[PDB]
């Protein structure tokens, strides 16, 4: 439970844990899909793919190292996992790929083979992963003509028109030192890693800063991807949520826990202490749903996603769900809040403390890049337990009550009513 | 064309410097319509109800 | 318009306030119209004719 972070020439962040069996090392840059353009959209995802290319991956496999990368909206990460003893050989492969081979990975035979793979990759996503496809379009319409609208995997049209030069241009503008953080998770000590880093000098493009842009903004709107050939309807609906480092960061996440997630086929899920379940189970309004409180640097999204085969009652699904959310402003109970606290801790714990260091790296990296530090799991619980019904009400009355929404859906959505009908349900009539 | 590239709505969208601009106008209109309707309904109801009160020709002072 | 946000603050006007304002309107509006009407017809009214009579 130690969050150590020091700065020499580069900012080093680590979180050591005795028993772990393995150690993960990697660099996390403060720029992701939110930094791209509509035309070079997908460059970051492309970088990730060559970094994991058969060539670069085989070089690490001989050495007994495993590679992992993750492209997000606000950040980007390249991670190498190793045994606690080879904590130095991971750094050799890291530097060898970001300075030495930052020209060998970009060969005309490797690039074309990779491009052909991310194309079949992004295509497969759009053709079959409907729930994530819908969630991606939700960001697209909610944050249209703004940084958060760009999809992480990039679009097919911007991808196929991408060249080696675009990779370089992005790398020379974002893979900078002032826009990076070296992260180490597993079991290795902070002093053990910082020494191996401060050993090898050479700045390489120091003092250089990444380009600036315009602030992200939420726009109440919708995108309907109707497709009657699909056997279900997948929808996602949300309001402007909370950005990371917001006073209500936790109040929002708790609010989403109150309604939680559901799976009609799992006996135990049908028994949860969620009032909404009394309404949706009678006629089986859906196969599943899940609420979320997505947070990013400039903004976020609070809402839910759902999947259903009850195509003639989608209006009841949306109506009952929105009536429940109305409650947060006027009648949420003490016990609902308390149930949420307990469940929020359990989920927040299971995330922050998993038996996998690669997840730890992403969580640590993403946090330190935005606030310059990481809030300890024990510190979070103190904030969570401090939330009162009055807090949730004040939050809901500002973020949910009579506020614009963003909608996205695909499949048999003929039954999903017009925007104004959904929007009207964001409140209730009163004397 | 990619579905992720939202068409242009610039001609319709208001340059958001005053977030609750359209809301305040809509709610004032809706509120004023509700006001004048209620007064109209009240006047209509009273007109019909008063037609049943003693007629001008039957108020003879004996 | 910030004039709206001072009284109702981003929320719509509620029925009670609408009904209350309607009763007020009815009285005010009627006097305003009757006044204008009688003034516009000054000289023609019975009130005016009675003033010119003495019996
Ligand atoms: C059934 C539906 C009918 C709809 C007809 C529509 C065609 C338009 C002509 C309407 C004529 C009646 C009203 C009238 O003459 O009052 C006139 C005002 O009329 C209006 O404002 C009409 C607009 C209302 C439209 C409907 C609103 C919603 C419908 C409600 C249904 C429920 C004068 O009103 P008043 O204050 O003198 O009062 C009256 C007046 O002074 C009386 O003489 C007095 O006795 C009483 O006490 C007083 O309150
Ligand atoms: C015959 C002549 C009759 C003349 C009388 C005119 C009626 C007066 C119109 C005033 C409208 C007042 C109003 O605001 O009504 C609202 C209800 C709400 O309908 P809603 O679907 O639940 O709301 C969506 C819109 N909100 C309320 C969120 C803003 O919307 C309604 O129920 C309005 C329907 C009225 C039908 C009459
Ligand atoms: C037919 C005879 C005519 C009778 C009179 C006509 C009807 C007049 C109704 C007047 C007010 O009715 C009023 O409507 C507004 C919406 O417009 C409601 O407001 C509700 O929706 C609005 C809009 O999303 C929200 O901002 C608000 O917080 C919510 O309470 C209010 O609670 C209700 O009280």
Task: Please indicate, yes or no, if residue B11 is contained in any of the structural domains.
Answer: yes
Q: Name the strand (E) or helix (H) holding A82.
A: strand A76-82
Please compute Rg for chain B using Cα positions. Answer: 26
Cβ partners under 8 Å of residue A143, min gap 6:
A149, A216, A217, A218, A219, A299
Question: How was it solved?
Answer: X-ray
Q: Name the strand (E) or helix (H) holding A4.
A: strand A4-7
Domains and CATH numbers, chain A: 1-202 (3.30.830.10), 209-431 (3.30.830.10)
Closest CA to A304 of A326, A327, A325, A328: A325
Domains and CATH numbers, chain C: 1-55 (1.20.5.260)
Instruction: Please answer yes or no on whether B35 and C15 come within 8 Å at the CB atom.
Output: no
Taking 3-state DSSP, the helix, strand and coil percentages for chain C, each rounded to the nearest 5, stand at 65, 0, 35
- Within A189-297, strands assigned E span 221-226, 233-240, 261-263, 288-295
Task: Please indicate, yes or no, if residue B3 is contained in any of the structural domains.
Answer: yes
Instruction: Please answer yes or no on whether B2 and A149 come within 8 Å at the CB atom.
Output: no
Q: Name the strand (E) or helix (H) holding A305.
A: strand A300-308
Closest CA to A357 of A51, A177, A90, A46: A90
Instruction: Please answer yes or no on whether C16 and A431 come within 8 Å at the CB atom.
Output: yes
Q: Which DSSP string do the residues of A18-76 spell out, in sequence order?
A: SS-S-EEEEEEES--GGGS-SSSTTHHHHHHHHHTSHHHHHHHHHTT-EEEEEE-SS-E
Please state, in angstroms and as integers, the Cα–Cα distance from residue A228 to each residue in A5, A348, A414, following that order.
Answer: 53, 38, 8
Closest CA to A91 of A21, A15, A32, A12: A12
- Contact between residue A182 and residue A10 where contact means Cβ atoms under 8 Å apart: yes
- Contact between residue A81 and residue A57 where contact means Cβ atoms under 8 Å apart: no
CA-CA-CA-CA torsion sign (A44, A48, A54, A60): positive
Helix-helix angle A249-259:A314-330, to 10 degrees:
130
Looking at the 3D structure of chain B, how many domains does it have? Answer: 1
What six digits make up the tokens of A61?
A: 């496999």
Instruction: Please answer yes or no on whether C16 and A402 come within 8 Å at the CB atom.
Output: no
Q: Is A257 exposed, middle or buried (0-12, 13-18, 19+ CB in 10 A)?
A: buried
Ligand 2, atom 22: closest residue by C-alpha: A424
Please state, in angstroms and as integers, the Cα–Cα distance from residue B54 to each residue in A55, A415, B43, B45, following that order.
Answer: 103, 57, 19, 17
Q: Is the CB of B45 under 6 A from ligand 3?
A: no
- Contact between residue A12 and residue A189 where contact means Cβ atoms under 8 Å apart: no
**Beta-ladder partners of A6:** A12
Domain range enclosing B39 = 1-55
Atom of ligand 1 minimally distant from the CA of B45: 32
Task: Please indicate, yes or no, if residue B16 is contained in any of the structural domains.
Answer: yes
- Contact between residue A190 and residue A4 where contact means Cβ atoms under 8 Å apart: yes
Neighbours of A363 (CB within 10 A): 18
Q: Please, which chains are in contact with C (at least 3 CB pairs closer than 8 A)?
A: A, B
Which CATH number is B38's domain given? 1.20.5.270
Chain CA centroid to CA A329, Å: 27
- Contact between residue A411 and residue A314 where contact means Cβ atoms under 8 Å apart: no
Q: Is the CB of B37 under 6 A from ligand 2?
A: yes
Closest CA to A47 of A92, A78, A75: A78
Distance from CA of A100 to the nearest CA of C (A): 58
Q: Is A224 exposed, middle or buried (0-12, 13-18, 19+ CB in 10 A)?
A: middle
Q: Which of B5, B13, B16 sits opposite A38 (nearest CB)?
A: B5
Task: Please indicate, yes or no, if residue B61 is contained in any of the structural domains.
Answer: no
Please list every residue in chain A whose beta carbon sits closer than 8 Å to the beta carbon of residue B2: 155-158
CA-CA-CA-CA torsion sign (A268, A303, A242, A248): negative
- Contact between residue C19 and residue B38 where contact means Cβ atoms under 8 Å apart: yes
Confirm or reject contact between C12 and chain B (CB < 8 A): yes
The rounded distance, in Å, linking the Cα atoms of A42 and A167 is 10
Task: Please indicate, yes or no, if residue B60 is contained in any of the structural domains.
Answer: no
Identify which ligand lies nearest to the alpha carbon of A400.
Answer: 3
């Amino acid at each position: 439970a130690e969050v150590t972070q020091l700065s020499n020439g580069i900012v080093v962040a680590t979180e050591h844990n005795p028993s772990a069996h393995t150690a993960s090392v990697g660099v996390v840059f403060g720029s992701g899909a939110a930094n791209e353009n509509p035309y070079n959209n997908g460059v970051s995802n492309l970088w990730k793919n060559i970094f994991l290319s058969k060539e670069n991956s085989a070089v690490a496999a001989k050495e007994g190292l495993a590679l992992s990368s993750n492209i997000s909206r606000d950040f980007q990460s390249y991670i190498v996992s190793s045994l606690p003893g080879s904590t130095d050989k991971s750094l050799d492969f890291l530097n060898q790929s970001f300075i030495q081979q930052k020209a060998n990975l970009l060969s005309s035979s490797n690039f074309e083979a990779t491009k052909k793979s991310v194309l079949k990759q992004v295509q497969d996503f759009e053709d079959n992963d409907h729930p994530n496809r819908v969630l991606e379009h939700l960001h697209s319409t909610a944050f249209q003509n703004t940084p958060l609208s760009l999809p992480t995997r990039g679009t097919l049209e911007s991808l196929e028109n991408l060249v080696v030069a675009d990779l370089e241009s992005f790398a020379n503008n974002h893979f900078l030192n002032s826009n990076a953080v070296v992260v180490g998770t597993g079991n290795i000590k902070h002093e053990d890693l910082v020494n191996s880093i401060e050993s090898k000098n050479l700045s390489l493009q120091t003092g250089t800063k990444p380009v600036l842009k315009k602030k992200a903004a939420f726009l109440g709107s919708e995108v309907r991807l109707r497709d009657d050939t699909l056997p279900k309807a997948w929808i996602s609906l949300a309001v402007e949520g909370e950005p990371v480092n917001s006073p209500n960061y936790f109040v929002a996440k708790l609010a989403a826990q109150i309604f939680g997630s559901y799976n009609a086929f799992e006996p135990a899920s049908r028994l949860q202490g969620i009032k909404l379940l009394d309404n949706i189970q009678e006629y089986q309004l859906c196969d599943n749903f899940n609420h979320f409180s997505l947070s990013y640097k400039d903004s976020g999204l609070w809402g839910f996603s759902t999947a259903t085969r009850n195509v003639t009652m989608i209006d009841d699904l949306i109506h009952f769900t929105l009536k429940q959310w109305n409650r947060l402003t006027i009648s949420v109970t003490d016990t609902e809040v308390e149930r949420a606290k307990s469940l929020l801790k359990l989920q927040l714990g299971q995330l922050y403390e998993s038996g996998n260091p690669v997840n730890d790296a992403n969580l640590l990296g993403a946090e330190v890049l935005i606030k310059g530090s990481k809030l300890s799991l024990g510190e979070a619980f103190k904030k969570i337990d401090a939330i009162t019904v009055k807090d949730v009400k004040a939050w809901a009355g500002k973020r949910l009550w009579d506020q614009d929404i963003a909608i996205a859906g695909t499949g048999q959505i003929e039954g999903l009513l017009d925007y104004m009908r959904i929007r009207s349900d964001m409140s209730m009539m009163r004397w | 064309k990619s579905t992720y590239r939202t068409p242009n709505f610039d001609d319709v969208l208001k340059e958001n410097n005053d977030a609750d601009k359209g809301r305040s106008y809509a709610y004032f209109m809706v509120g004023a319509m509700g006001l004048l309707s209620s007064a109209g309904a009240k006047s209509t109801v009273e007109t019909f109800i008063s037609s049943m009160t003693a007629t001008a020709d039957v108020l003879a002072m004996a | 318009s910030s004039l709206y946000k001072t009284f109702f603050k981003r929320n719509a006007v509620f029925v009670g306030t609408i009904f209350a304002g309607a009763f007020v309107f009815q009285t005010v509006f009627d006097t305003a119209i009757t006044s204008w009407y009688e003034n516009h017809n000054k000289g023609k009214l019975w009130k005016d004719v009675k003033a010119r009579i003495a019996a």
